[PDB]
């Protein structure tokens, strides 16, 4: 539902190597059987300094 | 017997050779060396001479 994130990094977080892991909490709809479903996230750099 | 035309002369010269100033330029290549300028970046660049 809520599709946008706004993660922002500053001078301490960049200066140590910024890793962004993922933690996913999931419940598969009842009875659905798939293979190799894609998940695509658009990374926009909106403002840098 | 002669009626002298009474006129004697003095003279001098003025030498204006150069222009008042020499604006020696040593241009700046501001991304510099061992530095980096990125898109959207913000900062300062200094050239003493
Ligand atoms: Ca921080
Ligand atoms: Ca000159
Ligand atoms: Ca900027
Ligand atoms: Ca900067």
TrEMBL record, chain A:
| Highest taxon of source | Archaea
Identify this protein by name: Uncharacterized protein
Part of the whole protein covered: 130 to 178 of 178
